[PDB]
Ligand SMILES: [Mg+2]
Ligand SMILES: [Mg+2]
Ligand SMILES: [Mg+2]
């Protein structure tokens with residue numbers, strides 16, 4: 258069904274581009290607390306190039322260019338600030354391919370009959386919650402125009418394992434690891450860890466709220482129509498990530514969603530209630546919800562409540578907050594050509 | 597020397613654009629603690645327009661589109677995310693004029709033979725530290741395509757008047773109210789309030805550091821060549837702004853910079869030392885410095901130290917931190933046309 262694709266286009270000119278003066282803002286941070294970094298580099302075009310010629314930058318397993326901003330509803334492509342000339346003309350158009358973690362800078366006409374083309378650029382960088390699942394240090398070697406710039410980044414993820422300091426106190430945690438702020442659909446992906454302490458909890462209930470204290474302060478929309486939940490039993494809690502990334506097809510997870518057919522209730526506005534009952538294992542709840550158009554930050558709160566299995570007393574409750582900005586500067590407009 | 601200018605261009609088409617569904621993220625915040633807001637609106641083109649036609653948005657006295665990001669070294673013009681089509685083509689180019697607090701959206705060719713052009717856009721909004729000097733509520737009425745959208749914003753500026761809780765304890769405050777992250781010059785504007793408590797301080801010294809604890813953690817560059825200081829005596833401290841905006845030509849300020857010819861020392865790396873001596877009035881120090889290219893956040897720390905005028909004892913010292921991000925995604929490149 259056709260032939261080669263290797264982005265042939267106006268041909269790759271990484272062989273005519275030299276990156277230098279590579280800098281990283283910081284090499285240690287906590288992605289669970291808005292922690293992220295930045296990169297900057299200089300680049301000079303060593304030979305004559307044309308409009309349509311392009312050079313690239315590739316990210317290693319440990320990094321992503323989009324972070325918690327989901328672009329799956331945008332062809333899995335992330336728009337990037339272009340490199341501009343003093344006049345303001347675009348010297349090159351920038352785009353980030355989520356799948357190949359590759360940045361593509363395509364030169365415009367400005368490059369036609371020009372020499373000594375020299376400049377610089379900086380880009381935001383984040384953790385790859387899926388490939389850097391645990392806290393620790395990773396190689397973060399970056400490739401710019403077929404040149405390597407070695408780095409080492411340390412991720413100190415705030416631990417997902419948290420709760421009341423009591424032998425069998427309530428304990429739950431969460432993190433919104435995906436927010437679509439560009440497509441217009443306004444979706445978000447959130448991972449919830451119920452009982453990551455692996456304690457024995459009686460008559461436990463979990464609440465996933467689309468707000469924290471004031472419903473009007475959050476854009477979150479949690480309802481039977483706006484929210485989709487999938488529940489999994491964790492076999493080995495220590496194999497559970499600290500970045501909250503959780504693949505529904507993970508072998509360490511046993512999906513028990515069906516068993517919860519009638520254990521999920523939408524009793525109160527913007528609140529999904531889950532009846533877990535007596536449990537001893539850790540559970541993962543994969544949330545796929547939406548937020549409104551008020552532009553308010555997406556604020557969520559997960560609560561876990563329970564009593565002692567044996568005495569049905571010794572009540573305990575624990576809560577965890579989440580908050581992601583939904584802001585997406587710019588605008589969108591579309592019209593139809595006249596008949 | 598010529599004629600009219602009123603941005604004639606491809607003519608103003610505000611008369612063919614209707615804004616609606618106006619929303620403000622929040623109406624109350626603290627600009628001294630990263631407090632700012634956002635606006636969003638829908639817009640439809642009511643008549644046929646061409647490439648080059650443009651509509652505008654005007655901000656009231658209480659707001660600015662740039663905030664603490666200085667654009668004076670960029671023709672006092674602020675680049676703004678364009679309005680894109682599904683295809684990704686630019687429906688309109690956006691630009692913000694700092695001077696006239698006006699946003700100009702210029703339609704491209706995409707608009708030529710099109711109808712039902714409909715869309716939306718959102719923009720960051722900040723306080724006008726100069727026109728909303730004091731904490732309180734102001735009218736924040738915004739004009740979009742010759743249509744008004746009334747608002748009321750309340751600014752709770754963290755008070756500049758702070759220091760040791762002692763009849764004559766050290767007391768100082770500051771705020772970086774201007775950072776140039778686009779031109780390449782890397783300048784910053786910081787206002788310092790020395791003794792805003794109007795206490796009587798003996799043998800007082802003030803230190804303006806371009807870092808906080810670790811010199812390597814900040815991009816700040818404070819030195820005889822990188823820093824320029826102007827010192828003013830405050831006549832009525834209550835007339836002093838809470839947003840830290842301080843015009844050197846303000847009537848409430850008496851410049852005593854010359855008198856400090858030999859009272860300013862650069863003894864320690866990244867630290868400017870000022871010998872005030874015995875003082876009772878409040879002083880304003882206008883700082884014009886630079887930061888390096890490490891991309892590190894601009895972190896500063898101002899310290900005030902003193903003893904009791906009468907006993908030359910009862911030592912006191914107070915410090916104040918500042919921190920602004922220097923990050924400016926994107927890139928710059930320039931070449932020369934070949935001979
Ligand atoms: Mg190369
Ligand atoms: Mg257990
Ligand atoms: Mg109009």
Ligand SMILES: [Mg+2]
Nearest residue numbers: 794795876877
């Ligand atoms: Mg006094």
